[PDB]
Each structure stands twice: as structure tokens, then as C-alpha cells.
Amino acid sequence: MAITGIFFGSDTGNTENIAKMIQKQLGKDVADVHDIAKSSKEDLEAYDILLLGIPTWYYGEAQCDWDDFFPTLEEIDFNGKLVALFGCGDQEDYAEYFCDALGTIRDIIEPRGATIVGHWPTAGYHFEASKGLADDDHFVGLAIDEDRQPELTAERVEKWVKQISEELHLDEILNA
Ligand SMILES: Cc1cc2nc3c(=O)[nH]c(=O)nc-3n(C[C@H](O)[C@H](O)[C@H](O)COP(=O)(O)O)c2cc1C
Numbered sequence: 001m002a003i004t005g006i007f008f009g010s011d012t013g014n015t016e017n018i019a020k021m022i023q024k025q026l027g028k029d030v031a032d033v034h035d036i037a038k039s040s041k042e043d044l045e046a047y048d049i050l051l052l053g054i055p056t057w058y059y060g061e062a063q064c065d066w067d068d069f070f071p072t073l074e075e076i077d078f079n080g081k082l083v084a085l086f087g088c089g090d091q092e093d094y095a096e097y098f099c100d101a102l103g104t105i106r107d108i109i110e111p112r113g114a115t116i117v118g119h120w121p122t123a124g125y126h127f128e129a130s131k132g133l134a135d136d137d138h139f140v141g142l143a144i145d146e147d148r149q150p151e152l153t154a155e156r157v158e159k160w161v162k163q164i165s166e167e168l169h170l171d172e173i174l175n176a
Contacts, residue, residue: 004031004170005044008053009063009101014088014150015053018157022051022086025161027174036069041076049168050078050114052105053086060100060131070108079113084164085141086118086157087132088150095128099143102132106140117167118142120160 006022008015019033091098119138134140142160144150165171
């Protein structure tokens with residue numbers, strides 16, 4: 001079976017394309033793609049590496065499928081699991097809520113013993129606040145935006161996948 005579980009929350013379906021652009025680089029032998037709706041606690045524990053994609057909506061809201069799973073997420077064993085986060089957003093009016101829901105996963109996985117990878121630079125975050133920040137210089141996960149919407153996506157998710165592949169040591173699996 002695959003060693004990486006990619007799980008993506010969605011509404012407009014944009015995150016499915018991100019999950020596929022991740023999986024195609026890693027290879028199907030290395031990564032598989034899921035939506036938390038079909039998951040149980042053991043469905044994550046089966047994997048060593050977990051890529052948890054989450055969009056943010058309606059002023060820092062998490063999508064209902066992930067929100068309903070959070071009381072199960074806090075029971076999952078993450079001890080020694082490698083975890084990376086990804087997301088997309090709009091912040092023109094949502095200026096304090098850009099990719100807010102990244103913080104919601106990041107808060108739960110660490111005390112359950114996760115090892116975090118896959119930071120992404122802000123390149124000088126411009127707006128009021130964002131809860132996905134690990135530092136003012138970098139988000140804790142991939143957070144794509146280009147003029148209030150996700151575009152110029154493929155080059156950014158290629159760079160992010162290549163970065164996690166050298167933290168996770170998937171690079172020496174996928175380039176073989
Ligand atoms: C009414 C509305 C509210 C939104 N609220 C936020 C928000 O609080 N934070 C954010 O980062 N993005 C926000 N977004 C942007 C969406 O996350 C983004 O455009 C995209 O549609 C997400 O698609 P996906 O869930 O299918 O991946 C919002 C979009 C709309 C239309």
C-alpha cells in the first residue's frame with residue numbers, strides 16, 4: 001500500500017486538483033488521495049506520512065466534513081507520523097482569516113505527537129492576520145494566493161512538494 005495519505009477538504013473542488021498534483025509527483029506507489037468523509041480514526045493511522053489539505057470559508061470557517069471529523073482527529077495517534085498541511089484562500093475582505101483553518105489542524109496534531117514539515121514562505125504577508133503563520137516569514141503549510149484567488153498554482157505546489165520530499169526523504173523514492 002501507499003505510505004502517504006493525502007486527505008483534502010473541498011467546496012468548489014479546487015483542492016482535488018492540488019491533491020492530484022501532489023500524488024502525481026510522489027507516485028501512486030508512494031501516495032494515495034482521500035476525503036475525510038470516508039475516514040475513521042485508523043484510516044489516518046495506516047499511513048506514516050499525512051498530507052492534510054484544508055480550504056477556509058466564511059470568515060475563518062472550516063468545511064463541514066473536516067469540522068465533523070475534528071472530535072475524531074483529537075483521538076488519532078500521530079506519534080511519529082510526519083504531517084504536512086496545504087490550503088488555498090481569499091483575504092480581500094477576509095483580511096484576518098487567510099487559510100485560517102490550517103491552524104485548526106496544526107493545534108491538534110502536535111500534542112498527539114505529529115512531526116510537522118512543509119513550511120511555505122509568506123514573502124511579506126500583506127494583510128491584517130493569518131492563523132496559518134508559524135512565523136511572520138512563513139506559513140506552517142502551503143497557502144496559495146495570487147491577487148485574492150489561487151492562481152499560478154502548479155509552480156508553487158511543485159516547489160512545495162519538492163521541499164517536503166527532501167524533509168520526508170520521498171525524493172530518493174520518487175526520483176529512483
Ligand atoms: C463567501 C466566501 C468566503 C470565503 N472565506 C475565506 C476565508 O475566510 N479565508 C480564506 O482563506 N479564504 C476564503 N474564501 C476563499 C475560498 O477558500 C477559495 O476561493 C476557494 O474557492 C476554495 O475552494 P476549495 O474549497 O474547493 O478548495 C472564501 C470564499 C468565498 C466565496
